[PDB]
Amino acid sequence: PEFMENLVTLSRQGIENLMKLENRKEPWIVVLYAPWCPFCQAMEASYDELADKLAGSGIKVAKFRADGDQKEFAKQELQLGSFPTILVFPKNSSRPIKYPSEKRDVESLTSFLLEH
């Protein structure tokens, strides 16, 4: 039973790719998570819902496990405050934008993007 199954998992190699590749034709939303965090578990279904309703939208929805060895990497470069953090990567953006990670904000995020 894997954690947050609807979201594809970036590796450290993968997300350092995401941040260095540009001409990204598509925006990304990336959840910085850690599978022992209670709020991560309670938000898990909120993120799974986000991913389903955004599937086929052109927005890639992914997750990156940011505890342990990655924790300081995520703290310096990935704007990881505390778990979970939501990073939004626009097509043409100076930097990923940290986005509030509470339930109604996620519902706000989904429904907004659906009207493009």
Numbering used by the authors: -3 to 112
List sentences from the manuscript.
To provide insights into the structural basis of the AtAPR1 redox domain, we produced and crystallized the C-terminal redox domain of Arabidopsis APR1 (residues 353–461) and obtained crystal belonging to the tetragonal space group with the following unit-cell dimensions: a = b = 58.2, c = 86.7 Å. Finally, the crystal structure of the AtAPR1 redox domain was refined to Rwork = 17.9% and Rfree = 25.0% with high-quality backbone geometry checked by Ramachandran plot. The structure of the AtAPR1 redox domain is a compact spherical molecule comprising a central core of five-stranded β-sheets flanked on either side by four helices. The fold of the redox domain arranged in the order β1-α1-β2-α2-β3-α3-β4-β5-α4 is similar to the thioredoxin fold but not glutaredoxin fold. The redox-active motif (Cys33-Pro34-Phe35-Cys36) is located at the N-terminal end of the α2-helix, consisting of residues Pro34 to Leu50. The packing of the sandwich-like architecture is mainly maintained by hydrophobic interactions between the sheet and helices. Surface potential distribution of the redox domain shows most positive-charged residues around the redox-active motif. The molecular mass of the AtAPR1 redox domain in solution determined by size-exclusion chromatography was about 13 kDa, which indicates the monomeric form of the AtAPR1 redox domain. As a whole, the structural information indicates that the C-terminal redox domain of plant-type APR1 adopts a non-canonical thioredoxin fold with exceptional orientations of helices α2, α3, and α4, which is quite different from typical thioredoxins. Notably, the surface charge distribution around the GSH binding site of the AtAPR1 redox domain is ideally complementary to the charge of GSH, but other thioredoxins are not.
The first step is the reaction between the key enzyme APS reductase (APR) and APS to generate a thiosulfonate-enzyme intermediate. In contrast to the cooperation of a sulfonucleotide reductase and a thioredoxin in prokaryote systems, in plants, the protein involved in the pathway is only a single polypeptide which consists of two distinct domains: a sulfonucleotide reductase-like one and a thioredoxin-like one. In plants, the C-terminal domain of APR itself serves the function like thioredoxin. To gain more insights into the C-terminal redox domain of plant-type APR, here we present a comprehensive structural and biochemical study of Arabidopsis thaliana APR1 (AtAPR1).
